[PDB]
Every structure is written in structure tokens, then in C-alpha cells.
Design an enzyme around this catalytic site. Structure first.
Site, PDB file in Angstrom:
ATOM      1  N   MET A 180       0.843  -1.198   0.000  1.00 15.30           N
ATOM      2  CA  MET A 180       0.000   0.000   0.000  1.00 15.30           C
ATOM      3  C   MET A 180       0.850   1.209   0.000  1.00 15.30           C
ATOM      4  O   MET A 180       0.438   2.258   0.498  1.00 15.30           O
ATOM      5  CB  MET A 180      -0.836   0.047   1.232  1.00 15.30           C
TER       6      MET A 180
ATOM      7  N   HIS B 196       9.143   1.061   3.166  1.00 18.71           N
ATOM      8  CA  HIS B 196      10.281   1.138   4.079  1.00 18.71           C
ATOM      9  C   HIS B 196      11.185  -0.065   3.805  1.00 18.71           C
ATOM     10  O   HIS B 196      10.912  -0.877   2.918  1.00 18.71           O
ATOM     11  CB  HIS B 196       9.745   1.177   5.487  1.00 18.71           C
TER      12      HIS B 196
ATOM     13  N   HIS C 189       9.781  -3.528   3.040  1.00 18.41           N
ATOM     14  CA  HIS C 189       9.372  -3.730   1.659  1.00 18.41           C
ATOM     15  C   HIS C 189      10.579  -3.985   0.794  1.00 18.41           C
ATOM     16  O   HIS C 189      10.517  -4.799  -0.153  1.00 18.41           O
ATOM     17  CB  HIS C 189       8.577  -2.526   1.101  1.00 18.41           C
TER      18      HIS C 189
ATOM     19  N   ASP D 170       8.860   9.191  -2.773  1.00 18.40           N
ATOM     20  CA  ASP D 170       9.806   8.339  -2.100  1.00 18.40           C
ATOM     21  C   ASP D 170       9.604   6.900  -2.648  1.00 18.40           C
ATOM     22  O   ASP D 170      10.594   6.256  -3.033  1.00 18.40           O
ATOM     23  CB  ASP D 170       9.580   8.334  -0.588  1.00 18.40           C
ATOM     24  N   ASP D 171       8.347   6.426  -2.739  1.00 15.85           N
ATOM     25  CA  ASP D 171       8.128   5.012  -3.210  1.00 15.85           C
ATOM     26  C   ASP D 171       8.841   4.666  -4.530  1.00 15.85           C
ATOM     27  O   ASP D 171       9.684   3.769  -4.566  1.00 15.85           O
ATOM     28  CB  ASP D 171       6.634   4.588  -3.241  1.00 15.85           C
TER      29      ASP D 171
ATOM     30  N   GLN E 218      12.879   4.639  -4.354  1.00 10.41           N
ATOM     31  CA  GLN E 218      13.399   3.387  -3.797  1.00 10.41           C
ATOM     32  C   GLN E 218      13.338   2.189  -4.763  1.00 10.41           C
ATOM     33  O   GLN E 218      14.313   1.418  -4.885  1.00 10.41           O
ATOM     34  CB  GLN E 218      12.671   3.074  -2.506  1.00 10.41           C
TER      35      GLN E 218
ATOM     36  N   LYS F 208       5.092  -9.775   9.514  1.00  8.84           N
ATOM     37  CA  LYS F 208       4.621  -8.913  10.622  1.00  8.84           C
ATOM     38  C   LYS F 208       3.089  -8.961  10.759  1.00  8.84           C
ATOM     39  O   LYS F 208       2.528  -9.228  11.822  1.00  8.84           O
ATOM     40  CB  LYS F 208       5.055  -7.435  10.470  1.00  8.84           C
TER      41      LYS F 208
ATOM     42  N   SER G 200       7.298  -0.592  10.314  1.00  6.06           N
ATOM     43  CA  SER G 200       5.914  -0.359   9.988  1.00  6.06           C
ATOM     44  C   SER G 200       5.700   1.080   9.538  1.00  6.06           C
ATOM     45  O   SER G 200       6.337   2.024  10.079  1.00  6.06           O
ATOM     46  CB  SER G 200       5.003  -0.586  11.187  1.00  6.06           C
ATOM     47  N   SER G 201       4.802   1.204   8.556  1.00 10.03           N
ATOM     48  CA  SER G 201       4.299   2.500   8.088  1.00 10.03           C
ATOM     49  C   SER G 201       3.906   3.360   9.251  1.00 10.03           C
ATOM     50  O   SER G 201       4.122   4.580   9.222  1.00 10.03           O
ATOM     51  CB  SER G 201       3.074   2.337   7.159  1.00 10.03           C
ATOM     52  N   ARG G 202       3.346   2.719  10.279  1.00 14.28           N
ATOM     53  CA  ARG G 202       2.709   3.438  11.357  1.00 14.28           C
ATOM     54  C   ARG G 202       3.669   3.856  12.488  1.00 14.28           C
ATOM     55  O   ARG G 202       3.262   4.573  13.389  1.00 14.28           O
ATOM     56  CB  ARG G 202       1.548   2.643  11.929  1.00 14.28           C
TER      57      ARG G 202
HETATM   58  C1  LIG Z   1       9.979  -8.075   5.562  1.00 16.50           C
HETATM   59  O1  LIG Z   1       9.831  -7.042   6.591  1.00 16.50           O
HETATM   60  C2  LIG Z   1       8.649  -6.338   6.565  1.00 16.50           C
HETATM   61  C3  LIG Z   1       8.303  -5.787   7.799  1.00 16.50           C
HETATM   62  C4  LIG Z   1       7.102  -5.076   7.926  1.00 16.50           C
HETATM   63  C5  LIG Z   1       6.268  -4.940   6.839  1.00 16.50           C
HETATM   64  C6  LIG Z   1       6.582  -5.447   5.623  1.00 16.50           C
HETATM   65  C7  LIG Z   1       7.761  -6.133   5.465  1.00 16.50           C
HETATM   66  C8  LIG Z   1       5.537  -5.125   4.771  1.00 16.50           C
HETATM   67  C9  LIG Z   1       4.601  -4.415   5.468  1.00 16.50           C
HETATM   68  C10 LIG Z   1       3.398  -3.859   5.063  1.00 16.50           C
HETATM   69  O2  LIG Z   1       2.509  -3.492   5.846  1.00 16.50           O
HETATM   70  N1  LIG Z   1       3.280  -3.587   3.770  1.00 16.50           N
HETATM   71  S1  LIG Z   1       1.952  -2.872   3.065  1.00 16.50           S
HETATM   72  O3  LIG Z   1       1.260  -1.759   3.831  1.00 16.50           O
HETATM   73  O4  LIG Z   1       2.427  -2.106   1.882  1.00 16.50           O
HETATM   74  C11 LIG Z   1       0.939  -3.972   2.607  1.00 16.50           C
HETATM   75  C12 LIG Z   1       1.390  -4.940   1.744  1.00 16.50           C
HETATM   76  C13 LIG Z   1       0.508  -5.916   1.265  1.00 16.50           C
HETATM   77  C14 LIG Z   1      -0.823  -5.882   1.658  1.00 16.50           C
HETATM   78  C15 LIG Z   1      -1.686  -6.869   1.173  1.00 16.50           C
HETATM   79  C16 LIG Z   1      -3.000  -6.843   1.599  1.00 16.50           C
HETATM   80  C17 LIG Z   1      -3.444  -5.860   2.505  1.00 16.50           C
HETATM   81  C18 LIG Z   1      -2.603  -4.885   3.004  1.00 16.50           C
HETATM   82  C19 LIG Z   1      -1.267  -4.897   2.567  1.00 16.50           C
HETATM   83  C20 LIG Z   1      -0.379  -3.925   3.056  1.00 16.50           C
HETATM   84  N2  LIG Z   1       5.077  -4.323   6.725  1.00 16.50           N
HETATM   85  C21 LIG Z   1       4.423  -3.735   7.930  1.00 16.50           C
HETATM   86  C22 LIG Z   1       3.939  -2.344   8.027  1.00 16.50           C
HETATM   87  O5  LIG Z   1       4.308  -1.538   7.171  1.00 16.50           O
HETATM   88  O6  LIG Z   1       3.199  -2.121   9.038  1.00 16.50           O
END
Ligand SMILES: COc1ccc2c(c1)cc(C(=O)NS(=O)(=O)c1ccc3ccccc3c1)n2CC(=O)O
Ligand SMILES: COc1ccc2c(c1)cc(C(=O)NS(=O)(=O)c1ccc3ccccc3c1)n2CC(=O)O
Ligand SMILES: COc1ccc2c(c1)cc(C(=O)NS(=O)(=O)c1ccc3ccccc3c1)n2CC(=O)O
Lengths: 289, 273
Positions: free
Chosen positions: A38, A42, A45, A86-87, A90, A158, A194-196
Site C-alpha cells: 500500500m 520502508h 518492503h 519516495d516510493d 526506492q 509482521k 511499519s508504516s505506522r
Molecule cells: C519483511 O519485513 C517487513 C516488515 C514489515 C512490513 C513489511 C515487510 C511489509 C509491510 C506492510 O505493511 N506492507 S503494506 O502496507 O504495503 C501492505 C502490503 C501488502 C498488503 C496486502 C493486503 C493488505 C494490506 C497490505 C499492506 N510491513 C508492515 C507495516 O508496514 O506495518
């Protein structure tokens, strides 16, 4: 089909453009890897992207789409971080060759009509107070998988409940795609990326280390059993200023309807001010530890 | 990872989803266009017309699935039609984890047939989705008799970005116009005679339609009204997507009725004025 320049970042908005490029590439021998995001990218991703790049001969498609159908509320949709400049930068820095950035109109030209109904897992943990949230996520992920038709699709661990549900969707609808879970990338103190995290003030940022500290304390305590593992995690969360625990649960790796055996997953959700944080870890109980 | 055996121009039968999936992939790699005709077995002329429509695509290989969603004669017929693949999975093979993730249809599924059976279409769309994912056909063939079902399928394909062409094939009918159905065998002679009123009403409407919508509806209703033991559940004129009928142009007229214990359905293209 649209232009595709190898070795460069090609950005497509139209689902039909990415679908045609994807199919053309798969027929020329490249395996297509999908990293759905989404946006607001970071290092976690970039770990997903790196994992996808490791697959010999791959072409990596990263999707960026803030899916209105998994937000309820209440300004959650409006609030979601958007940093599209930024997206793409990267992605270019990592040598990704395709970004798929569809419009809401192109994804949902008929509004919400046919949808995916997840299994009972979607009503528990994160879904207990958000009853349609995971129907929104699985519907969008199904769409993205159909549009891109990747060989493998990559997710962070996560959001582990979301990952499990996606594996269910893949099995249950006979989707021909490998689901790859990638271990959570953490800040140097162990805070899950995390984004948050950007919503934590300095004091909340300092307290937030308690989630990962509680989880690793539990994983090491678990030689003494499940009770000790949970009690250790609870003590660390209890010692942390202004951390309000939502849930702290130990489950089987598929997240139930089976009792925990020797190996499991400990999940935590907590609020710091208004920011809700999630984290989880593998747990081996007793002898397996 | 050897491809399961396939013998070209013979009837090849597979029960394992993985097997038909590997064969259909091997076939598509060699040029053939994969055509899917989903059935619940007990094949009749309507099924054979879906088969004949699929067989005429140049370069086609025809997959007929036979699955009752919760004999050797069916196979004989398929053999005689020159079908190369029958897919005959068990319930367990299709649902190895039980009922879990499913498809939820849009609100059209609550209308019309979705009145007596509000979860019927969720079941049909779920299994159609799985069949499309296992076989990955270029084209999938359904009869027009179950028209609401058909429209729901095209909504599925659109909504989930599926890469298949949905082909609706005109309903095969008996000599007097009664739509083919596995239920027609249950009608005693009085019910069988009365049942012709469904098709008679719809063709009368389609011809009355030069005089407008109301004329078309009143003509169908008069025909149904001339039949004894025909309890009409609905008689509705809609646009071709089953939304509200536009002031003129193209639509569909649908009817459902109960004769004794048997529920019968039929529908027809209507052009207004
Ligand atoms: C391998 O290390 C990591 C660590 C944390 C990650 C990620 C990878 C990826 C995420 C993440 O939330 N990615 S996302 O917001 O772009 C995302 C990615 C895929 C999704 C699929 C269905 C619904 C929501 C989605 C949200 N997040 C958590 C976060 O951003 O809260
Ligand atoms: C347990 O408490 C609730 C409260 C509301 C619920 C539900 C459960 C279940 C639904 C529901 O499934 N509604 S829905 O079929 O129209 C639906 C189904 C899928 C959805 C996907 C993304 C966003 C919204 C969605 C709404 N809905 C929304 C409703 O009935 O309007
Ligand atoms: C081209 O002309 C016709 C005319 C009537 C047809 C057919 C074709 C097909 C059927 C029919 O219902 N076939 S089926 O019971 O095997 C059937 C019925 C519903 C299905 C729904 C999803 C997937 C497969 C399905 C298969 N039927 C009616 C019937 O057999 O009850």
C-alpha cells in the site's frame, strides 16, 4: 501490448497494461514475482523486493494501491500515509522493472460487488472489531494476483494473520502461485518496521520496544512452558509506560482450529496513544526450544 | 515433475485437480486452446450443445468437468463427442480443507432465484472460480437457461479480473419449446403438458414486444394464466445485466414456476418496440 524497457523502472496504471506485459514476459521465460504494497515503502518492503530479485531470471512487479475496501471507520482511509515520490525512487534504487499503480476506478469500476468471504479466522484477532477488513484485503489480493499472474507473491510476516489468510485464499481457490513469507525487518532495538511507526512520538517510540522485547523474552522463556512464555511477555508489556495491550495470544502456526502443540506463534497487538502496533514471533514450546 | 499421461484424440479422465491442471498447462504450451464445459453429469442434449460449441473453436481441446457440488454412460457420450478430457474430482479433492474461503456474490444473488435459495449462488460462484483456476480455460461455456447464474458468472469474471471468455449458449429445447432440464423427467403427463406454458408465454411476449413492455408482460401473463397447476413465482422483465429494464432497447424476460413439486425456470431475449 505497452512498451517494456528491460533494466528500467516501467510504471503501468491500467490493469490491462501490466497483465499483457506480465504474460508476454512469462512466455519469454521470465518468472514474474509480485510484491503487493500500500505504498509508503520502508526497508521491510525493500527486503520483500530483494527476496523477489533473488529468484533466478525473475522480473519483479511491485504494486502500490491503497485499497479503500479494507478500511472501515472513520478517516482511516484518508489518514493512510501516501509518499508516492519516495516510493518510486526506492524501487528505481533496487532495480525493480515494473511498478503497478492502478486507480481506484480501474480496480473497482462497478464498486464493491462480488467479493471474497474469508473463513472463520477473519473474525478473530484483528478481525474481531473489524468484521469486513479481511474480506477487503483478500478481495484486493485476489484481484492483484489475477491481473499480474505472478509465479510467487511475497509478504512480510509482521501481519501474520493476514499472511495466513492469504495462504488460505491461495489453497481454497486453487490459485497457481507460491506464497512467500519474509521475516520481519526490525529497527536496531527490535521494533518491527511499519508504516505506522512514524506516528509514535519520542516517548512512545522508546516504549514501543516493549512489544518485541516481550516476544523474544517469551520465546526464550518457552523452555519452561507456555504459561511461563506468556507470563514473561505479559510482564515486559506491564512494565512499559503507556503501552495498552489489546491482545497477547499464543496459537498454533496456522492460527487455529487446532490446539497448540510444540511449535506456535505468539501475537501481540497494543495501542500507544492512538497508534496501534502489531508484532509476532515463532515460539517453540518446551523440548522444541 | 513428469506431466500426467495424455493421449490425444482419446478420452482422458483425471480425478486429481493437480493432474488436470498439469495437463491443461502442457496442452496450452503446445498451441491448443483449452475450452471448459462444467457439468454435474447426467449429460443431456443441452450439455452436448455446450460441447459442440466448444469443439468448434479451431485448435480446441475440450475439458468437461463432472462434479456434484455439495456414469460410464456420461463418459461414453463424451467419447462419442470427441472430448479429450473429463475432469471427475471427488468432493474431498475439491474441498480438502472443507468450506473455508468462499465467493460472496453481489446483491443480484439475493433477487429472483436467490429468494428461495439465498446461498445457492455463493456455492455456484465458488466452485466455478475453483474450476476456472484448476483448468485455466481460454473459454468457458454455460447454457442460457439459468440466466441469472450466467450473469452472476460474468460479474465474477469481471470483478475478480479473470482471464477467461464466458460463452453463453442458447438454451436447447424439446420439440414443443420446453427448456431442457434434468427436472423435466419428473413431470407427469398433465404437468408436462402444462409446462409448455413457460416457453409459450415467453415467445408470445417476445413477439408482442413491438407493442411495448406492458403488452409483452400482459401477453406472457395471459399464457401462464391459461395453464392449470402452474404457480408462478415471478415473471420479470429486466435489462440484459438483470438491472431495471430501460425504457426501450434490449432486455431479458425471466419466469419461474412450480408444477406440483418441480420448480421450472425459463427466460428469453426481448427487444422493446
Ligand atoms: C519483511 O519485513 C517487513 C516488515 C514489515 C512490513 C513489511 C515487510 C511489509 C509491510 C506492510 O505493511 N506492507 S503494506 O502496507 O504495503 C501492505 C502490503 C501488502 C498488503 C496486502 C493486503 C493488505 C494490506 C497490505 C499492506 N510491513 C508492515 C507495516 O508496514 O506495518
Ligand atoms: C459482525 O458484524 C458485522 C457488521 C457488518 C457486517 C458484517 C458483520 C458483515 C458484513 C458484510 O459482509 N457486509 S457485505 O457482505 O455487504 C461486505 C462484504 C465485503 C466487503 C468487503 C470490503 C468492504 C465492505 C464489505 C462489505 N457487514 C456489513 C453490512 O452488512 O452492511
Ligand atoms: C445449451 O442448453 C442447455 C439447456 C439446459 C441446460 C444446460 C444447457 C445446462 C444445464 C445444466 O444445468 N447443466 S448442470 O446441472 O450440469 C450444471 C448446472 C449448474 C452449474 C453451475 C456451475 C457449474 C456447473 C453447473 C452445471 N441445463 C439445465 C439442466 O440440466 O437442469
Amino acid at each position: 501490448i505497452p512498451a517494456f524497457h528491460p533494466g528500467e523502472l516501467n510504471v503501468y496504471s491500467a490493469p490491462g497494461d501490466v497483465a499483457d506485459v506480465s504474460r508476454a514476459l512469462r512466455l519469454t521465460g521470465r518468472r514474474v514475482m509480485l510484491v503487493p504494497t500500500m505504498g509508503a515503502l520502508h526497508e521491510g518492503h525493500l527486503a520483500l523486493v530483494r527476496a523477489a530479485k533473488r529468484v533466478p531470471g525473475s522480473v519483479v512487479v511491485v504494486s502500490i494501491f491503497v485499497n479503500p475496501m479494507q478500511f472501515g471507520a472513520g478517516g482511516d482511509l484518508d489518514a493512510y500515509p501516501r509518499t508516492p515520490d519516495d516510493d518510486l525512487a526506492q524501487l528505481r534504487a533496487e532495480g525493480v522493472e515494473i511498478a503497478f499503480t492502478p486507480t481506484t476506478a480501474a480496480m473497482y469500476p462497478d464498486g464493491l460487488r462480488t467479493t471474497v468471504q474469508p473463513g472463520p479466522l477473519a473474525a478473530e484477532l484483528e478481525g474481531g472489531p473489524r468484521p469486513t477488513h479481511f474480506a477487503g484485503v483478500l478481495t484486493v489480493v485476489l484481484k492483484l494476483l489475477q491481473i499480474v499472474r505472478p509465479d510467487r507473491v511475497f509478504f512480510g510476516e509482521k501481519d501474520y494473520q493476514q499472511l495466513v489468510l492469504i495462504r488460505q485464499l491461495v489453497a481454497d481457490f486453487n490459485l497457481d502461485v507460491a506464497v512467500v513469507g519474509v521475516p520481519t525487518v526490525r529497527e536496531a532495538d527490535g521494533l518491527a518496521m511499519s508504516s505506522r511507526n512514524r506516528y509514535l512520538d519520542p516517548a512512545q517510540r522508546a516504549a514501543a520496544v516493549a512489544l518485541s522485547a516481550a516476544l523474544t523474552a517469551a520465546a526464550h522463556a518457552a523452555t519452561a512452558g507456555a504459561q511461563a512464555a506468556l507470563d514473561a511477555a505479559r510482564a515486559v508489556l506491564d512494565a512499559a509506560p503507556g503501552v495498552a495491550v489489546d491482545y497477547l495470544e499464543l496459537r498454533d502456526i496456522g492460527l487455529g482450529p487446532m490446539p497448540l502443540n510444540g511449535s506456535g506463534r505468539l501475537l501481540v497487538a497494543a495501542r500507544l496513544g492512538t497508534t496501534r502496533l502489531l508484532d509476532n514471533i515463532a515460539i517453540e514450546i518446551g523440548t522444541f526450544a
